[PDB]
Amino acid sequence: MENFQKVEKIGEGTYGVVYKARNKLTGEVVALKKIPSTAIREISLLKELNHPNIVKLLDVIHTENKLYLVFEFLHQDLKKFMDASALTGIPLPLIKSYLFQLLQGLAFCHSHRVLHRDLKPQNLLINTEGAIKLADFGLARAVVTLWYRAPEILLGCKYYSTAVDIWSLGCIFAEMVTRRALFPGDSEIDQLFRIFRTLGTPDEVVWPGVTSMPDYKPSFPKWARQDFSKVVPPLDEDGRSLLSQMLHYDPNKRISAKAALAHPFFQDVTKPVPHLRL
Numbered sequence: 639m640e641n642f643q644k645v646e647k648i649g650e651g652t653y654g655v656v657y658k659a660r661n662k663l664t665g666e667v668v669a670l671k672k673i674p675s676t677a678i679r680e681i682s683l684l685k686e687l688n689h690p691n692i693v694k695l696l697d698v699i700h701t702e703n704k705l706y707l708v709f710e711f712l713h714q715d716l717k718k719f720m721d722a723s724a725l726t727g728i729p730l731p732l733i734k735s736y737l738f739q740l741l742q743g744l745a746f747c748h749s750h751r752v753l754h755r756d757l758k759p760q761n762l763l764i765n766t767e768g769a770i771k772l773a774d775f776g777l778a779r780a781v782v783t784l785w786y787r788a789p790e791i792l793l794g795c796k797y798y799s800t801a802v803d804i805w806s807l808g809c810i811f812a813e814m815v816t817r818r819a820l821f822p823g824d825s826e827i828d829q830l831f832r833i834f835r836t837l838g839t840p841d842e843v844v845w846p847g848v849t850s851m852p853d854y855k856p857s858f859p860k861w862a863r864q865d866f867s868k869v870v871p872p873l874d875e876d877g878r879s880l881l882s883q884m885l886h887y888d889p890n891k892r893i894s895a896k897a898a899l900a901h902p903f904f905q906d907v908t909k910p911v912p913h914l915r916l
């Protein structure tokens with residue numbers, strides 16, 4: 639750590655403090671996260687999971703029982719960008735470009751059997767060139783917001799799949815379009831009931847095996863499903879169809895990142911430049 643000069647506090651992550659810092663030898667500006675042997679090995683495997691839509695893990699430093707993760711630095715996160723764009727809304731071609739790029743990043747990690755598990759706007763990082771990148775990939779395996787949590791996790795599935803990331807990204811896509819969180823739960827039951835109130839209480843018809851899940855209760859209220867036309871106006875039919883497939887209850891029916899990239903919604907995808915004031 640004597641090789642780094644702290645510049646400013648980026649924020650407080652799930653694991654520890656994140657600083658913007660300067661590497662004293664290379665002159666490199668990085669993000670430094672201050673955090674068992676199985677953790678060392680899993681984190682070391684993440685150093686090889688390189689993709690243009692994944693924030694680069696430059697180095698892993700284990701000293702005096704403290705673990706430091708050195709990452710590529712980006713100037714802005716999507717949460718702050720969405721707040722800054724609240725009055726006008728993020729233009730649809732930019733939303734579409736960001737969703738396309740995030741799906742490319744997920745398709746890559748998922749092809750390597752690596753899940754994010756905790757996607758949220760705060761860990762999606764953006765630059766002046768129009769890129770968007772996933773941060774904290776694979777750290778979950780190695781107040782916390784529930785808004786993006788998949789229903790199978792809320793229902794107590796211990797062995798969840800890559801579909802949990804598609805659910806989180808669908809929630810984020812809806813929030814970029816409407817300028818409001820889709821399911822802003824403030825407890826696990828409030829989160830689950832908000833999902834049920836919009837998508838309908840799940841049953842054996844739409845989700846075989848749901849009633850056998852660890853935290854499923856037959857006493858859950860039974861709410862009717864709402865039309866996506868009410869949920870995400872003014873999104874077009876291609877976007878609503880894609881979002882519906884990213885929000886399927888059954889993780890097995892939920893669209894994969896690779897199949898989502900082929901969706902007609904992306905026929906006219908482009909890579910616009912965001913308006914960024916740094």
Ligand SMILES: O=C(Cc1ccc(OCCN2CCCC2)cc1)Nc1cc(C2CC2)[nH]n1
Binds near residue numbers: 646648649710714763
């Ligand atoms: O999280 C960001 C975006 C960012 C940048 C600078 C910020 O400044 C923070 C507070 N300052 C105090 C005075 C004014 C504002 C805040 C957020 N970037 C990251 C993260 C990572 C790796 C995953 C670890 N890489 N890049």
